[PDB]
Coordinates of C-alpha atoms in Angstrom, one line a residue:
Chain A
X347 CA -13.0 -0.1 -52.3
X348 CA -16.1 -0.7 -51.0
X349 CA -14.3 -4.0 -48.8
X350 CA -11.8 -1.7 -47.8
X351 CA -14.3 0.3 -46.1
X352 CA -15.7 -2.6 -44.4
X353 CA -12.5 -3.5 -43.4
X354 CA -11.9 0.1 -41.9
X355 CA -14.9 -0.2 -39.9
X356 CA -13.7 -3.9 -38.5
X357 CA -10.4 -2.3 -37.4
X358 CA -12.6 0.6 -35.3
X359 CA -14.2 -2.1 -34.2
X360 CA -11.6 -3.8 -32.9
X361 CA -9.9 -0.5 -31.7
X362 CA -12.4 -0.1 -29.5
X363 CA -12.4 -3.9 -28.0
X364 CA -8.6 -3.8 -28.0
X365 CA -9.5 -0.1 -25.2
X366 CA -12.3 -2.0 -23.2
X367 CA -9.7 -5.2 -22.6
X368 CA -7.3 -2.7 -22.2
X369 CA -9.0 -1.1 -19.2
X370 CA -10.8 -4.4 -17.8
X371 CA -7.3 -6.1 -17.8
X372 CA -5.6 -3.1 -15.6
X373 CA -8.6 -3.2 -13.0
X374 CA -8.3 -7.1 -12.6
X375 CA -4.6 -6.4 -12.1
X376 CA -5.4 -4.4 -9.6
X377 CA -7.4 -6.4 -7.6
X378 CA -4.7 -9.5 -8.2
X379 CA -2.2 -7.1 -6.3
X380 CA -4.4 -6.0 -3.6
X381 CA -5.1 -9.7 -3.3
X382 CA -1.9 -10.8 -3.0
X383 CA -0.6 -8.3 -0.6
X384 CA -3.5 -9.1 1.4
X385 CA -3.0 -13.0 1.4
X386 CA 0.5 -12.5 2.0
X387 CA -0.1 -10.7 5.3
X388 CA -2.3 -12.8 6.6
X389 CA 0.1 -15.9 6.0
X390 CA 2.8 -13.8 7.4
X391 CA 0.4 -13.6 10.8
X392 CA -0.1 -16.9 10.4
X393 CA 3.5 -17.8 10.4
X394 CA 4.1 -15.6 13.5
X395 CA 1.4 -17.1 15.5
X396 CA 3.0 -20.6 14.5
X397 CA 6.4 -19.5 15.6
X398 CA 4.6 -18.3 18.7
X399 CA 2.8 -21.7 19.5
X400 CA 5.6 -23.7 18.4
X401 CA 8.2 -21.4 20.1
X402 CA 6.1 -20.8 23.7
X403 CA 9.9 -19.4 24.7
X404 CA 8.9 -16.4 23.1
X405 CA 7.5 -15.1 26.0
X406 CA 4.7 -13.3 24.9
X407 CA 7.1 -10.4 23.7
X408 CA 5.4 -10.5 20.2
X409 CA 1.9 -10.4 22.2
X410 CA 3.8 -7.0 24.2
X411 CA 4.0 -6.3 20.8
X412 CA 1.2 -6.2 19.6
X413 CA -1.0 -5.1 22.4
X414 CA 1.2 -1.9 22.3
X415 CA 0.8 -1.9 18.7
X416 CA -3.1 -2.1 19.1
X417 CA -3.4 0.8 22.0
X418 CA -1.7 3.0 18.9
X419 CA -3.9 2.2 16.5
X420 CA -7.0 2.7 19.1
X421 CA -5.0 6.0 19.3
X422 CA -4.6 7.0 15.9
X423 CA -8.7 5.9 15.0
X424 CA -9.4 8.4 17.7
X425 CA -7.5 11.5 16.1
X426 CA -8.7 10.5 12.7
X427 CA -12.3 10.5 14.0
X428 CA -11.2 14.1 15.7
X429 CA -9.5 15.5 12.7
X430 CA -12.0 14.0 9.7
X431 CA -14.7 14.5 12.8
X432 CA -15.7 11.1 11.9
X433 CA -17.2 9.4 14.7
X434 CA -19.2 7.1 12.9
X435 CA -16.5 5.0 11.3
X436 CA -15.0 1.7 11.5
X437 CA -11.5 0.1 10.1
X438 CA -13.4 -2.1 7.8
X439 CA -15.4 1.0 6.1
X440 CA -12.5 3.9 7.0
X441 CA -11.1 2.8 3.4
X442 CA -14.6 4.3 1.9
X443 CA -14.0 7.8 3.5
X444 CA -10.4 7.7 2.9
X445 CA -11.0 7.5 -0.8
X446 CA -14.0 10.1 -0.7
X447 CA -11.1 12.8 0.7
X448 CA -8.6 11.6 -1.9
X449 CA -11.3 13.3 -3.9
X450 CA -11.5 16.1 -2.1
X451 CA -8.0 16.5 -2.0
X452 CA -7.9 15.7 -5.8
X453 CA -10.6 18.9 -6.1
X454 CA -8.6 21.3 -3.7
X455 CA -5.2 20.4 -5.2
X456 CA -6.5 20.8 -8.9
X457 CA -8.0 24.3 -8.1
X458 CA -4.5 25.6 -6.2
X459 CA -3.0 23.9 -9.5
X460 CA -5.1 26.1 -11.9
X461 CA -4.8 29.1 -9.1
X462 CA -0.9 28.6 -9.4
X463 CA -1.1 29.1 -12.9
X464 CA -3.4 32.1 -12.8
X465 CA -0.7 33.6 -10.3
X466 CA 2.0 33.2 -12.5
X467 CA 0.4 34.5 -15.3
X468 CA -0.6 37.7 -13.2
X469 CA 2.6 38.2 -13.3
X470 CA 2.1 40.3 -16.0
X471 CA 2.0 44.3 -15.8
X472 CA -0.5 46.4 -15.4
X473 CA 0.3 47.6 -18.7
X474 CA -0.8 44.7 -20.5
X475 CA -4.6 44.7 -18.9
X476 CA -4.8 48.5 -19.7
X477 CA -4.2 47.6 -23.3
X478 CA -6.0 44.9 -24.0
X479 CA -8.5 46.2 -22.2
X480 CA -8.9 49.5 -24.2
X481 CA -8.6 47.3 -27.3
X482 CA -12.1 45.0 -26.8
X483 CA -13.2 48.6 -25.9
X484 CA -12.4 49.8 -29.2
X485 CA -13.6 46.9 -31.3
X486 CA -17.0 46.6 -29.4
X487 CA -17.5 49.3 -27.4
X488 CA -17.4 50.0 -24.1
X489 CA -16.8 47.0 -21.8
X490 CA -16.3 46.0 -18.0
X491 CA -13.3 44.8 -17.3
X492 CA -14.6 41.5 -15.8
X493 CA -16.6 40.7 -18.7
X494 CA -13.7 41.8 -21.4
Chain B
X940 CA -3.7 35.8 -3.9
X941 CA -6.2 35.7 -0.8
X942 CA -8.4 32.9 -2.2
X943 CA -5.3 31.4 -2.8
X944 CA -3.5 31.5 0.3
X945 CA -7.0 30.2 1.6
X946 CA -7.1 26.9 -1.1
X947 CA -3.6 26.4 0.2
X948 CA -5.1 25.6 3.6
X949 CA -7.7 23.8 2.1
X950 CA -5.1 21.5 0.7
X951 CA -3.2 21.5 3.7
X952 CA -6.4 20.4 5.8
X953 CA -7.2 17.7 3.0
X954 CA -3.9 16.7 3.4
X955 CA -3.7 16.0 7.0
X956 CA -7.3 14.4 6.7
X957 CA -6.2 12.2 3.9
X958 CA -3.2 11.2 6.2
X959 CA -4.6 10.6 9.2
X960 CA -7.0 8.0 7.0
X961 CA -4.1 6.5 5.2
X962 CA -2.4 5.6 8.7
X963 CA -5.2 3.7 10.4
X964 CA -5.2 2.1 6.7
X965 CA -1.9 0.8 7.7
X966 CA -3.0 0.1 11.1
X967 CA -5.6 -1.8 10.3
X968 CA -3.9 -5.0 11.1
X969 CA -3.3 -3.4 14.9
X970 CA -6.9 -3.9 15.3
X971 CA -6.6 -7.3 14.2
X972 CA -4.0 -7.5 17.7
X973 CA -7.0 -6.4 20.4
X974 CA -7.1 -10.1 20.3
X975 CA -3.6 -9.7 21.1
X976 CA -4.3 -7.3 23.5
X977 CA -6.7 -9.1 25.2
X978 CA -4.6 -12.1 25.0
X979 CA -1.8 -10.0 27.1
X980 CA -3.7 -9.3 29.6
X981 CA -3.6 -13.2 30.5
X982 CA -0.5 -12.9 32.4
X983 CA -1.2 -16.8 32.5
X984 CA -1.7 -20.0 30.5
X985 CA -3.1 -18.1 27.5
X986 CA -1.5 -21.4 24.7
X987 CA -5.4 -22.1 24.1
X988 CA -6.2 -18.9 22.9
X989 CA -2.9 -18.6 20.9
X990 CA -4.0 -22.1 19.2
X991 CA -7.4 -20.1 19.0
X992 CA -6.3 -16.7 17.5
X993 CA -4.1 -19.1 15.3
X994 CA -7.2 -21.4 13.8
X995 CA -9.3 -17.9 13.2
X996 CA -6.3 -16.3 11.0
X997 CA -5.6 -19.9 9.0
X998 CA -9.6 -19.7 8.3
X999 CA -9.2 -15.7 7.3
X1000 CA -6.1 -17.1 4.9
X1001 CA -7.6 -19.9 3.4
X1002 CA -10.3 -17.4 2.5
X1003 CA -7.7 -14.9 1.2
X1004 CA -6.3 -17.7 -1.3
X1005 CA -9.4 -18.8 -2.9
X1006 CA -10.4 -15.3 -3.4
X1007 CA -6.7 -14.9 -4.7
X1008 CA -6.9 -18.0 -6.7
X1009 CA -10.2 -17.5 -8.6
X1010 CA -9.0 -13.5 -9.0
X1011 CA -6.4 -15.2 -10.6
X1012 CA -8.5 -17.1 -12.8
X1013 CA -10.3 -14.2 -14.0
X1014 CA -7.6 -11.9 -14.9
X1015 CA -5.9 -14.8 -16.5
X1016 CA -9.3 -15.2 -18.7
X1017 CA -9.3 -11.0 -19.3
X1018 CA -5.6 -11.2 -20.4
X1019 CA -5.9 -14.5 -22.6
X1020 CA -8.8 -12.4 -24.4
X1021 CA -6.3 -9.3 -25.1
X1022 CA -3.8 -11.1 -26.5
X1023 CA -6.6 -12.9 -28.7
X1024 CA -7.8 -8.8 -30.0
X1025 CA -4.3 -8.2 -30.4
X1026 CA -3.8 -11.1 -32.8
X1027 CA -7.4 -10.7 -34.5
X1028 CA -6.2 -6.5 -34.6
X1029 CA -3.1 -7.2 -36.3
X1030 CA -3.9 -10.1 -38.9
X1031 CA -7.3 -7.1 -39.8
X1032 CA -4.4 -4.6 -40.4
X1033 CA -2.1 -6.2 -42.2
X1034 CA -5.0 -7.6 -44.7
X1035 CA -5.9 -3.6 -45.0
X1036 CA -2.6 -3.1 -45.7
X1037 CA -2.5 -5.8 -48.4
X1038 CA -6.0 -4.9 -49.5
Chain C
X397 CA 3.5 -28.8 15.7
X398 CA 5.5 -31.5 17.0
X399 CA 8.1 -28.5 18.4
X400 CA 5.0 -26.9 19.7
X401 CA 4.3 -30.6 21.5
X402 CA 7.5 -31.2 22.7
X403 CA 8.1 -27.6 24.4
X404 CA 4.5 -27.3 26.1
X405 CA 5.5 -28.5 29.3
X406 CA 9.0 -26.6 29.0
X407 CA 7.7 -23.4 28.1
X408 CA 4.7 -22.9 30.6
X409 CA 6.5 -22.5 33.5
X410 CA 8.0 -19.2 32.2
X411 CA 7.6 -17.7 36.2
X412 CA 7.1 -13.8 35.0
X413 CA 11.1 -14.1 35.4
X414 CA 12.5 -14.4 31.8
X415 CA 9.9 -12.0 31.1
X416 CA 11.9 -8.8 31.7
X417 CA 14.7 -10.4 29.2
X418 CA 12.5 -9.2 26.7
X419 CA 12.2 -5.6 28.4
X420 CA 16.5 -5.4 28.5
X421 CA 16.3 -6.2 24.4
X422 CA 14.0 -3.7 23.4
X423 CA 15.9 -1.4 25.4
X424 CA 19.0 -2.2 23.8
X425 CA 17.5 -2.4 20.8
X426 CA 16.3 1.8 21.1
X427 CA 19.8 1.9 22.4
X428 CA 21.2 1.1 18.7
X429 CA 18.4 2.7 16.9
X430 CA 18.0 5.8 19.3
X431 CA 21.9 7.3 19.1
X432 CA 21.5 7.9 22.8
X433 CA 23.8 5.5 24.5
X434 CA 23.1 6.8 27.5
X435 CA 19.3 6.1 27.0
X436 CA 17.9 4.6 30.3
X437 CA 14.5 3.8 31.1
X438 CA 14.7 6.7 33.8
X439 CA 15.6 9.4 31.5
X440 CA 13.9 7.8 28.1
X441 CA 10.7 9.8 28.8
X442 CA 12.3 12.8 28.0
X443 CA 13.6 11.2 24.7
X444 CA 10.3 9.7 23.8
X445 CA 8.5 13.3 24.1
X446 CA 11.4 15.1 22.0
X447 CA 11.2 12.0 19.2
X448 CA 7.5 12.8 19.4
X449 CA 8.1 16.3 18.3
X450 CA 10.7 15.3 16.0
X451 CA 8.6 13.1 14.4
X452 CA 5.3 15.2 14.4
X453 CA 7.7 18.3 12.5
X454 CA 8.7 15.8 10.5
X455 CA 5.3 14.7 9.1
X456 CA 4.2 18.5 8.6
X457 CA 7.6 19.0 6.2
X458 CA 6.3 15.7 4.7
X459 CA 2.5 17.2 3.7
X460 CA 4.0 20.7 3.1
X461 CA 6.4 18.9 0.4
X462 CA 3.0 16.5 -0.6
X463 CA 1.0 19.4 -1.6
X464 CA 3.6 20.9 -3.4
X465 CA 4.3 17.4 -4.9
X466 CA 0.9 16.9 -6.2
X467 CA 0.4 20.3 -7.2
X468 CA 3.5 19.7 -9.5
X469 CA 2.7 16.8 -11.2
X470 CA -0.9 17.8 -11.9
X471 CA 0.7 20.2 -13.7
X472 CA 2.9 18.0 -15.5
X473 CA -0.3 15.7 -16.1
X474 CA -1.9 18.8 -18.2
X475 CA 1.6 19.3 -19.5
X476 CA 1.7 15.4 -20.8
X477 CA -2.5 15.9 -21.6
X478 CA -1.7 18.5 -24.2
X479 CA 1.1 16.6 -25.8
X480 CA -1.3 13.7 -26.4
X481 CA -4.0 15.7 -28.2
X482 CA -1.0 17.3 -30.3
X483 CA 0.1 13.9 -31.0
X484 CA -3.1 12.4 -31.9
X485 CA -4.3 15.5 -33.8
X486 CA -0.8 16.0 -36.1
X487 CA 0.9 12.9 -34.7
X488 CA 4.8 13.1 -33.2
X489 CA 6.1 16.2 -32.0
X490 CA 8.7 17.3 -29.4
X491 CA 6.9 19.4 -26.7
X492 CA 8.9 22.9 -27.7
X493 CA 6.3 22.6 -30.7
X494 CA 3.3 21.5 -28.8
Chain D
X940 CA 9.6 13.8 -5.8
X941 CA 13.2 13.1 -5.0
X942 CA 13.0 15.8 -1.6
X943 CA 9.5 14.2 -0.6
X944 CA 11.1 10.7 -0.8
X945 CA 14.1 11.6 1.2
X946 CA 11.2 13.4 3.7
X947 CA 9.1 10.3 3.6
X948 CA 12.2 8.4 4.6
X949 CA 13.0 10.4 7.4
X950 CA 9.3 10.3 8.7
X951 CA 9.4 6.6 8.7
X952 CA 12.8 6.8 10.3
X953 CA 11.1 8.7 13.5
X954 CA 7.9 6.8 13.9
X955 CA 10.1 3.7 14.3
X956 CA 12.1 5.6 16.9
X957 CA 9.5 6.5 18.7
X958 CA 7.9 3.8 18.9
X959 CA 10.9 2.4 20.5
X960 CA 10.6 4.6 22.8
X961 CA 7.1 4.0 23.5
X962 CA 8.0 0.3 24.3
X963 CA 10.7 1.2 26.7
X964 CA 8.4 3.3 28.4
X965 CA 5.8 0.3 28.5
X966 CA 8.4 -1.8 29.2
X967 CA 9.8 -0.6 32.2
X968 CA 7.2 -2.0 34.3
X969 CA 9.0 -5.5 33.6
X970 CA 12.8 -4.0 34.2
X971 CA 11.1 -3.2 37.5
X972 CA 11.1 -6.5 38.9
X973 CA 14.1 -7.5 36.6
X974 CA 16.1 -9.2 39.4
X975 CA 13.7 -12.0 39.2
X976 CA 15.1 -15.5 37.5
X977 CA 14.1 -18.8 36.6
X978 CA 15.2 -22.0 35.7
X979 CA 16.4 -22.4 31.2
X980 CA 18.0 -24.9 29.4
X981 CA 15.7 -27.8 30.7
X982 CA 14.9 -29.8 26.8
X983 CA 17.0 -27.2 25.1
X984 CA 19.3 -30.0 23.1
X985 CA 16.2 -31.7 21.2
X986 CA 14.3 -28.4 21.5
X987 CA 17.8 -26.7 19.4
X988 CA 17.8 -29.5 17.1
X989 CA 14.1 -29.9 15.7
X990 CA 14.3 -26.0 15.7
X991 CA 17.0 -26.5 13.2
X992 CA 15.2 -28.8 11.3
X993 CA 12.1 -27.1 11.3
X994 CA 14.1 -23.5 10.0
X995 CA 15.5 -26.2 6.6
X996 CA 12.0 -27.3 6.5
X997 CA 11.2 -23.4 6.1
X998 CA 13.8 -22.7 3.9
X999 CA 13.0 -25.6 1.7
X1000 CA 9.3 -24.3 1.4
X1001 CA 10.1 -20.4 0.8
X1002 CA 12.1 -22.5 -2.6
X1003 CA 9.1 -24.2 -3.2
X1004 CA 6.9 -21.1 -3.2
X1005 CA 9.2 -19.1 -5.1
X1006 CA 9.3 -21.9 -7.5
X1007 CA 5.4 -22.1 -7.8
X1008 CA 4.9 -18.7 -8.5
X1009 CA 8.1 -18.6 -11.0
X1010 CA 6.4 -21.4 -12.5
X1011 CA 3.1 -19.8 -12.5
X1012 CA 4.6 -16.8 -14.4
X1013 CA 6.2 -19.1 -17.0
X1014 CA 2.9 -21.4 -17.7
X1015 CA 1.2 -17.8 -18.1
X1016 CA 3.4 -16.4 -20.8
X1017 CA 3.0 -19.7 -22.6
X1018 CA -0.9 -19.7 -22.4
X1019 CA -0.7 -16.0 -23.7
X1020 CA 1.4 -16.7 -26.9
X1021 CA -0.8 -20.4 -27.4
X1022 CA -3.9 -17.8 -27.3
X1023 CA -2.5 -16.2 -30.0
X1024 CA -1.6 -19.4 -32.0
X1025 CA -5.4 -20.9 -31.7
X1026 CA -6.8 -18.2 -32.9
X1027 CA -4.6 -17.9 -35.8
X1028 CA -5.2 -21.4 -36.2
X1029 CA -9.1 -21.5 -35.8
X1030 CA -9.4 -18.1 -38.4
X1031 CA -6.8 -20.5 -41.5
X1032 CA -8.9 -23.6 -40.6
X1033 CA -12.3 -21.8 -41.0
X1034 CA -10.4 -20.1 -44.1
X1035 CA -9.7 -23.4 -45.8
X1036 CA -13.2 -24.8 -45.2
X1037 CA -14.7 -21.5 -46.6
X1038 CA -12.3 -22.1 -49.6

């Protein structure tokens, strides 16, 4: 019996272990993903700048390309620093503030989410407040309605 | 309902923010192009600083694939390691069972 | 490489006069994607600022369905949340029970 | 989720239109001279050929790199079940030495 037990607390154990790789293994995934789409962009550039060298013909319509490409994203850093009023940032650290407002947004979206169900639960009648109001009043005594 | 019409543009200002952020995420290659941009502007012989541009992103890849590699490596290790709980787990329950 | 070789002295003499090649495709190539086969480079200013507006109403549908969106499957997430601690506290259960 | 999809869809649809647009309008600079013309077609045989050659060389490699990583995927499954088997292994050896 006694074994048993021991063996019980070996299979926590390993509960617990089994969790923790669990979690480690999902995270390294992660990153192996991120990784990989990164690496593969950068070959793809590669690639294209190959192509380019190789095929001169294209006539610096890929370079049209991309310089237009580049004035929108010099415009679109601009109306993120206006509309996250950001103007210390950078496109190497933007990734930092972006995730700082997912929280936000996380916060703000979870407290609308418990504030939609709040509404929908007022839509009960006035009737129902009255009542149970009056009955905590009853049991303990006279109570405000806030604290009931 | 007022503090809730008033978290609702809350959300909506979060949500442009976090937008806005998310598409200079996507952009963020674009930068990569003021390269590009200044390479345009060359309206000549600009081959040298294509071979250039061209040497600086193999470096920048050859960079990306070790990191990919030996990220490789370790989430191989982390998922080598699971499978061994796994097997250690169920060989503890089944003698449980049998106990 | 060796392509790259062999077309250097071909390729540098472009003379800014294929250039404007690459000007006619991208205009035909708005011309297919843009359902505006009349869409000239005189008139495709007005088209550009009306796309603009199409696209910026566009985005503002897109965060006004996001917020719903998340709000939504947050609540679903607490839904799913309770079924687990019923689950782990009595063990399987349909969620008219929980 | 299935109406913000269909939205998301449509947004990407626009920003690709107008960006079209956007490189017209940048573009018309160069329809402005667009009566200019040049000389083509100087090396274009061997040019054509070693072009078509070089696109089987690329088509041979995008095999070889699907292959690899097919390959990789395979070799990984393999060292995840021979994880399992060693340590089975190692716990019946140390077993039999115990007994």
């Amino acid at each position: 019996q006694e074994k048993i037990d021991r063996y019980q607390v070996d299979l926590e154990e390993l509960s617990y272990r089994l969790e923790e790789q669990t979690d480690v293994v999902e995270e390294a995934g992660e990153l192996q993903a991120e990784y990989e789409a990164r690496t593969e962009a950068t070959e793809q550039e590669v690639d294209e700048l190959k192509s380019q060298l190789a095929d001169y013909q294209q006539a610096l319509d890929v370079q049209q390309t991309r310089a237009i490409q580049y004035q929108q994203a010099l415009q679109a850093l601009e109306r993120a620093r206006e509309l996250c009023r950001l103007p210390d940032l950078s496109v190497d650290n933007a990734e930092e503030w972006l995730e700082t407002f997912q929280a936000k947004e996380q916060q703000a979206t979870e407290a609308l989410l418990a504030l939609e169900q709040k509404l929908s639960v007022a839509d009960a009648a006035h009737n129902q407040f009255e009542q149970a109001y009056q009955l905590v009043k009853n049991i303990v005594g006279e109570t405000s309605r806030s604290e009931a | 309902q007022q503090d809730y019409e008033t978290a609702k543009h809350s959300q909506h200002q979060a949500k442009q923010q976090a937008f806005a952020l998310v598409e200079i995420v996507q952009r963020r290659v674009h930068f990569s192009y003021s390269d590009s941009a200044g390479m345009l502007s060359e309206n000549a012989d600009l081959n040298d600083k294509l071979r250039q541009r061209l040497e600086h992103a193999e470096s920048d890849r050859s960079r990306a694939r070790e990191q990919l590699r030996q990220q490789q490596a370790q989430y191989s290790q982390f998922n080598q390691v699971l499978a061994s709980l796994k097997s250690s787990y169920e060989t503890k329950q089944d003698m449980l069972k049998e106990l």
